[PDB]
Design a binder for this molecule. Structure first.
Ligand SMILES: O=c1c2ncn3c2ncn1[C@@H]1O[C@H](COP(=O)(O)OP(=O)(O)OCC2O[C@@H]3[C@H](O)C2O)[C@@H](O)[C@H]1O
Length: 252
């Protein structure tokens, strides 16, 4: 108890109750998910990781949950993001111009949560969970997000948008979920353009970050997939959000 088994934070307190509650809330608000049996969803979620070694999780483990979580998303209004989720969420909340993964049942259920079990016992581990870096990448949380992010990217069509954090050292990071999963799962048959919005943090007079080497890398990767690339700087994210809320404004 002075040393834990794994290097990462343990399962979020009251995990089962939280997931169940989020599912009830989601299905009450969103009419197309109004029929989903939230007990069945919890049962499937549990089944993915309980009694399993938390370094031996596979995408197959989550297939029952994926099935129950089946959901149509407007394919042309998807917003992806990397390392900038708060702005992405504040943006979509104004008038639902776009949808992030957290606007789907499954993304909503898991957002900000951590979970894992133990091999050959049905107990949730509230003490520690595997860290992706130090322990193992095939852990319940990591495998969940890769699985759901892949399916989300596969559903996209027309123009897909991505918000990137321009204050980061690597504005586009090939090791992120966006860069390692979503970019490679957009379907060129369906997706016309990927448009990146590079969000400035250098506050109030800055460079053209669409010329950043990592952005040029992203452009190259997506161009070679037969998808067009566009990029825009958002210099003042505060002004941006205000203009979204009230486009009837002088600077907007
Ligand atoms: O929606 C989430 C999400 N919500 C919560 N999380 C998500 N990860 C990926 N996604 C999807 O991938 C990207 C973001 O992942 P990232 O590039 O690793 O950013 P990031 O590096 O900010 O993501 C950190 C992060 O936070 C958890 C997940 O455990 C994880 O790796 C988005 O486009 C989403 O569609």
């Amino acid at each position: 108890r002075w040393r834990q088994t794994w290097s990462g934070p343990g399962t979020t307190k009251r995990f089962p109750e939280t997931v169940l509650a989020r599912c009830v809330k989601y299905t009450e608000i969103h009419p197309e998910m109004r029929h989903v049996d939230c007990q069945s969803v919890w049962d499937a979620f549990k089944g993915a990781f309980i009694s399993k070694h938390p370094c031996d999780i596979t995408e197959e483990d989550y297939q029952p949950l994926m099935k129950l979580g089946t959901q149509t998303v407007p394919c042309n209004k998807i917003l992806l993001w990397s390392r900038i989720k708060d702005l992405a969420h504040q943006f979509t909340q104004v008038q639902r111009d776009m949808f992030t993964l957290e606007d789907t049942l499954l993304g909503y259920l898991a957002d900000d949560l951590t979970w894992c079990g133990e091999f050959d016992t049905s107990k949730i581990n509230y003490q520690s969970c595997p860290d992706w870096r130090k322990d193992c990448s095939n852990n319940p949380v990591s495998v969940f997000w890769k699985t759901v992010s892949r399916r989300f990217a596969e559903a996209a069509c027309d123009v897909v948008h991505v918000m990137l954090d321009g204050s980061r050292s690597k504005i586009f990071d090939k090791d992120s979920t966006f860069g390692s999963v979503e970019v490679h799962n957009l379907q060129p048959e369906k997706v016309q353009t990927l448009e990146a919005w590079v969000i400035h943090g250098g506050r109030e007079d800055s460079r053209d970050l669409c010329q950043d080497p990592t952005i040029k890398e992203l452009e190259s990767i997506i161009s070679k997939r037969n998808i067009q690339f566009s990029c825009k700087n958002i210099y003042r994210p505060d002004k941006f959000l205000q203009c979204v809320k009230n486009p009837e404004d002088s600077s907007c």
